[PDB]
Amino acid sequence: SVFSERTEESSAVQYFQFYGYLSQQQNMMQDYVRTGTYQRAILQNHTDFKDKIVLDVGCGSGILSFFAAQAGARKIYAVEASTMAQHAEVLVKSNNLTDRIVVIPGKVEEVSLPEQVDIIISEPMGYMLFNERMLESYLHAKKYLKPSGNMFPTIGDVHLAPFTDEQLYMEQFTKANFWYQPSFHGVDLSALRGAAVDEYFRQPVVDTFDIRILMAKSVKYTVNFLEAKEGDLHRIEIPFKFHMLHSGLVHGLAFWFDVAFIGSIMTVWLSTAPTEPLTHWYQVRCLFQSPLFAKAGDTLSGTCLLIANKRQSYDISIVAQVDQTGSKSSNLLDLKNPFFRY
Amino acid sequence: RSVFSERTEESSAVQYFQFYGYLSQQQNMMQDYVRTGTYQRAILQNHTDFKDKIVLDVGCGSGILSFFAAQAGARKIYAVEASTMAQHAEVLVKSNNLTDRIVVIPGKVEEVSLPEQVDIIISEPMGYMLFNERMLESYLHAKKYLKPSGNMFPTIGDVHLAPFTDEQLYMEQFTKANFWYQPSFHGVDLSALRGAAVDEYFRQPVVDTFDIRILMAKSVKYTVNFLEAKEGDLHRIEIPFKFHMLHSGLVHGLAFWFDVAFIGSIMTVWLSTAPTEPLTHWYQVRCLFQSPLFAKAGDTLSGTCLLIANKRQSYDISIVAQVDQTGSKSSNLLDLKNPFFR
Amino acid sequence: RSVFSERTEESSAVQYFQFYGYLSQQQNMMQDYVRTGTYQRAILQNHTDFKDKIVLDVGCGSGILSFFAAQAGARKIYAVEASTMAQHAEVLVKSNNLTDRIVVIPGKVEEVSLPEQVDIIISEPMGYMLFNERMLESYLHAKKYLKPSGNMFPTIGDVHLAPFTDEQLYMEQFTKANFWYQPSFHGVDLSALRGAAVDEYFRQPVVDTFDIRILMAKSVKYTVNFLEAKEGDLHRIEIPFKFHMLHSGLVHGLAFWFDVAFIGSIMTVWLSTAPTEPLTHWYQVRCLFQSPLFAKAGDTLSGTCLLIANKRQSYDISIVAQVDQTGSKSSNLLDLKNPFFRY
Amino acid sequence: SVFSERTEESSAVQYFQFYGYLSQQQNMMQDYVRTGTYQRAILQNHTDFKDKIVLDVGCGSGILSFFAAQAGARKIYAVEASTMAQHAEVLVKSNNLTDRIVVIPGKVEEVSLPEQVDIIISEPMGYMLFNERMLESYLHAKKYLKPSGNMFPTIGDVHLAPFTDEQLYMEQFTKANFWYQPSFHGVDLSALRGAAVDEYFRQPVVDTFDIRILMAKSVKYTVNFLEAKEGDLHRIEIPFKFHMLHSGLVHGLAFWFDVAFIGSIMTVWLSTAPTEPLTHWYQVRCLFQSPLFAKAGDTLSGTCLLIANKRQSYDISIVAQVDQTGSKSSNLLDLKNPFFRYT
């Protein structure tokens, strides 16, 4: 299948094992911004659901399918590949909805659906939007979507902005300097210090921060889920030209995302921005190896290149320069192995 | 088709060795002064066990124990390591001018070939609750390279189990599970999953430390003598216990810690992870009962702790316990692979 | 087959009047200075409502309110009491040389005969949560003896409801019920009864006091006007509510208190059992939800509190509540007759 | 029936309602002395149960029946009159014992059993042993007992001893003196002071005490359950002659009880004595209206007369004198209305 071809088995096993835990479902469900917004998006756009056929991609415990049911869906196919599928079945029976919600265990790339659907619902967003590569499963599911069918969410906006955080930058060196000692219990560890620094710099930092560290208005990269193909997410090139609002050292780029549910009655937004209440997605920061000095009114230009890998994540390549001085910085980061700093 | 590969799922092995490939994890272990200092003291104070001897270091990581063996006058030390840390160990051996004495051999100790038999094996094979990671088996497997009358460091391991009362720990885990009691979470009845949620939460061993005043009886000790034991002995570990209750109250579960002893020619040195001793990176481990047992001071609490090895480099733990005077019984099944770090 | 006997099981009536027969219980009530002092102030400061008037004292107990009516210049006071306390009231009337003004009439006010109509009725008919004991109906029944211009003291009653958060109260009741979770209590599996145990514990309204900082929204008020109401109005009491949440958190249930007003010709005097006011022997009452509802500040929590009168001189309480924004719902059934005294 | 003839309906309703609550079962079950001793008595005398037919009188949740089952009983009839019967049925099913434990709802005086039993088990003891008059239901149940048959418990011993407790005595007057005031909000209450004192003195005091208040070795009254007839408990006369071990004022008599399970293998005792760990039976003290002065070596003689009433309790008459001085005291107490003093 399409899933198996783009995914290493060792990664898939661990991934679905993780999503098998009720504790993880509870964690997601307790995020009121997440759960409450999905409910509002679905219920306030009830005419998009009333007597319609629905597909729920990666349904977990089934919450979104129950929201679809509350909004009057005739039939809902809830697909889930983890062992959570069996717990969803239990809930469907206990809530007397066996006639309306049909749980289908398996990958959405592998299962068969009996009929085409009017609307697809899912929560395919990982850290930095793209992590987990579930957006591709969501897009793959459009083979089951009728012409003029809708998708919830309809679009996703990834936001990038440059930040200054001297303490975050310096912390990498302080940690690595453990190895810069000539007699640790009689052993000279200094030769490994450079390797430790490299290791810490490969890790994107998952944490939140005060918005006062942001040095320019964000640049937005939009994926329209109605129009996009799976293929569009294998190589994601995000050019940026930031107009600097403050002078100082730029230590890296900060990432967050919004999604929009574009219904017939209204558009509802779910934001993970640092200006908004914290979600279980937090925000993500990728450091530069060396900070770039910019003055207010300079432009900081470059590219963020995300290359999909077989571990259900991305290799991140960031190149940036201050156009006025020609000072340049790169970094290469492994999105699969983030540092949780919070 | 090696012994390691036969008892280990590939997905588990990949993740395991990836984890131990990170310098940050080496640093974490090395910064435990009780662990690093005690290993150094054990080796150096028993220098005649090392002077002009051949040594095998099983799972050497960064190589620290091999450097200690060298400081104590070892003629030759084979340092085996299966993670990518092997390459960093090589770097340190060169940078410390010890290429004549320390030979790094990358690979699993079950798979590599050594040119000669050794006088002594050194390792840190202990995981959480001693047994986790199933590295004790690799350590014992390595005895095929040990000369007759060869020694092992550590020489023996003692696991200790004792009943505890901790209402706050119990209520915390119970309170989390009770999230799934709600009849109307955004209009959805979750209560059918409540039993399954409780099972999941109570299946997790709790890794943290505690005041010794929670212990309700003198510990029971199970000893593994590394000189005598075979790999096979660790596939199924049955630990009988009969506790003489020193205090009345609710027993919420069993607490576990371990000591190891380095039995040298000059002296015996102990490394203890007991709650009476300074904290180590092993902490201590508590297995909760789903329902606490009431006992009076002077009652006996008897039963069995059964550890069954699995292919994820850990153990399924079965605990059966009863208050003999009343016949109040509790049985519980825990997944040592998925601990809760408090 | 009086009105009292028809609405009341004999076993409940026996126990009820036996309880109110004890001097120790009278002392308990009389020692509440807020209660005794406020009744005295209401009566004495409205002396022209009593001066040379005929008075009925419904459920007079030891007779204290009748003595207050006498101090305020009443010509004649009929003091009705169904418990054996009637005989102790007679003793006090003689010992205080008021035999010419206070006439004790033993029996239920639904059963006795009074020789004439009265200008004003006085009583303390309020139980826990106002309605408990169903004495408000005896008080209203007594209006058959009231002249057209006639007044009532108290004149009106306001019941207040507000949502509260109290994790410790919730966990306490839950922790007690969880005794019945054990799979091996001396070798016996009790877990099949766990649901029934929880129902039983959560069916009990909690009588005690609390800090007002647990209240999560402004109270909703339900008013009974004693001058206008009929006995029948109290058989089924429906209290709708729509709370505008002032704080985010888990709502563990609803808190209840009441005020009564003595609306006299000279002034109105209030007796409040609110948690903002000094403690009375009525305390306050909390009905827990079996499962708490999460609300955010600015949500609305709407539903109904339905009180259905029973033959045990109390009410079956039905509470249905939902957070409108999420549709999270809780319904609960409580036995007001069997409260848990937590103080 | 025999139960209905000796019991007022209003008393029976309230009584069985009380025992219907899981909270009350839990209270009793959590008494480790009670539950643990019953289990030990049954299990350590397993040959009295192995393949035998058993009757469990007033089984409540069924715990004693489950102990009988653990000891190898072939069949157990568990009789219970409260709504707890239905909860017991649930536990029998949940513990897969429907083939061995048969719950029979109703009064043991009214139900039918299909066959005679080898042994009766029960917990018929109330406060001071006799309260609740359940001992009579237990004895009544012997109509179902085979000739060889045993009873668990087999015998009950009530203990009486004189005590000195000045603070307990004085406390009655301090409480009553609330009424000894000439102007309580303008009302002279003093006429009721004597009546308040009388009321407090009619109540037996349920709490525990240090054994150092006891002024003489206890006197024992034994009921042998194998031999006694229901009738024997309608009028219980307990003569006493105490040989005073200490000088001082005797303020009343203290009561506790032991029961013995006399099995084939061993005798097991359950004691509620003040020398033993506290149980949910506590101990009971009946005050004298006036204390008696005695010197060490004097004899304090008299009678405790318990007269059964239709409220499932006893009217207690206590008469005592110091033989050397002829100083005499009486008291009359209502066992149905005890004062729970324990804090």
Ligand SMILES: COC(=O)c1cc(O)c2cc(NC(=O)NCCCCNC(=N)NC/C=C/[C@H]3O[C@@H](n4cnc5c(N)ncnc54)[C@H](O)[C@@H]3O)ccc2c1
């Ligand atoms: C190498 O090791 C590491 O370095 C590692 C290892 C780890 O495990 C780590 C875990 C971390 N945890 C963490 O904080 N994550 C944040 C998540 C927040 C946002 N959550 C989501 N909304 N998730 C998306 C929803 C998914 C659902 O859809 C189902 N589904 C997926 N695909 C299919 C398909 N094809 N067909 C059918 N159903 C499918 C799936 O099963 C779920 O139910 C952090 C770091 C780690 C590092």
Ligand SMILES: COC(=O)c1cc(O)c2cc(NC(=O)NCCCCNC(=N)NC/C=C/[C@H]3O[C@@H](n4cnc5c(N)ncnc54)[C@H](O)[C@@H]3O)ccc2c1
């Ligand atoms: C939420 O996420 C989870 O679910 C999760 C779950 C978890 O359990 C987690 C556990 C955590 N930490 C942890 O465990 N701390 C206690 C251990 C401290 C001390 N460790 C040891 N001394 N271990 C043994 C030494 C091994 C060395 O030997 C090498 N080696 C092994 N085998 C062989 C072989 N056959 N041949 C050759 N070399 C071999 C290996 O590469 C190493 O260098 C942290 C996070 C977790 C998260």
Ligand SMILES: COC(=O)c1cc(O)c2cc(NC(=O)NCCCCNC(=N)NC/C=C/[C@H]3O[C@@H](n4cnc5c(N)ncnc54)[C@H](O)[C@@H]3O)ccc2c1
């Ligand atoms: C077993 O444990 C339980 O289950 C339980 C359950 C409980 O509820 C418990 C309640 C407790 N205490 C309590 O409630 N405290 C504060 C609230 C009381 C505030 N006092 C009042 N104002 N009440 C109303 C006034 C009545 C007077 O009027 C007389 N009267 C009534 N009706 C008529 C009639 N038709 N005709 C003529 N006279 C009548 C009556 O005889 C009195 O003299 C304590 C323990 C409990 C235990």
Ligand SMILES: COC(=O)c1cc(O)c2cc(NC(=O)NCCCCNC(=N)NC/C=C/[C@H]3O[C@@H](n4cnc5c(N)ncnc54)[C@H](O)[C@@H]3O)ccc2c1
């Ligand atoms: C309003 O406040 C008050 O005025 C008040 C006044 C009070 O006195 C209070 C007393 C309190 N506590 C108390 O008493 N503690 C001492 C007793 C502890 C040990 N109890 C027993 N073992 N009881 C004997 C066994 C009974 C079981 O046998 C069943 N059963 C009985 N007869 C029959 C029959 N004929 N047929 C079939 N089944 C029958 C019955 O249903 C039960 O399951 C608490 C509160 C109070 C409040």
